[PDB]
A = this chain, B = another copy of it.
Amino acid sequence: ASKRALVILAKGAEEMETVIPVDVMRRAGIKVTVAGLAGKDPVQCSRDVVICPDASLEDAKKEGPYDVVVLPGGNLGAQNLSESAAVKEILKEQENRKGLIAAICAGPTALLAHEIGFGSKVTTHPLAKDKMMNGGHYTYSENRVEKDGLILTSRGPGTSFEFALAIVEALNGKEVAAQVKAPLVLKD
């Protein structure tokens, strides 16, 4: 009866955008797998924080399905996600089964690369707008968190808490999100 989340962690990911959702989601009782794109080895994030993944993406792929697939940002991390065929397969499968896909900051640009969710309203970091909108395949929003159908996006490191709580609310409901939020000492 336990919901499952997959967080895909590539070299150059924004480490704040990785840790905050993982932590919050685990506070909500979600089983999170931090899966390394290139293998089980430690991953050097954008600001040189080094994180050990829980599993390789190859192994984690075999223990699906997941109720949410989470794509952190960071410019080089998103580029590594956008180039990976394994990511493409994971995302395409998640879309077909109508599971949730969540991406923050530069992360949403991997959706474009992999032709995921065309027609949806999305947001990105302001600096990633032009790239996400190449071709006019999505509609852009400036909301800090945006959710259209099964596609949940958010704008940057400073929206990381709102993004994570939106995942909790989608998976476990508003009451659980409100319970996990109170001890965090968020402003609004």
**Which residues in A have some Cβ–Cβ distance to B below 8 Å?**
14-16, 19-20, 22-23, 26-27, 34, 42, 46-52, 125-127, 144, 155-159, 161, 183-188
Contact = CB atoms under 8 A, between A and B. Distances in A.
| Protomer copies | 2
Q: Which one of A15, A23, A42, A187 has the highest number of Cβ atoms from chain B below 10 Å of its Cβ?
A: A23
A187 B184 contact: no
B161 A184 contact: no
Contact of A22 (B47, B126, B161, B187): B47
Contact of A16 (B23, B127, B144): B23
A146 B15 CA distance: 26
A73 to B, nearest CB: 11
Contacts of A187: 144, 158, 187-188
A179 B161 CA distance: 21
Contacts of A14: 23
Given A19-B15, A19-B49, A156 B144 contact: no
A146 to B, nearest CB: 13
A157 B185 contact: yes
A47 B20 contact: no
Contacts of A16: 16, 19-20, 23
A184 B158 CA distance: 5
18 contacts: A14-B23, A15-B23, A16-B19, A22-B49, A23-B49, A23-B157, A26-B47, A42-B52, A49-B51, A50-B52, A51-B52, A52-B52, A125-B183, A125-B185, A126-B185, A144-B187, A158-B184, A158-B186
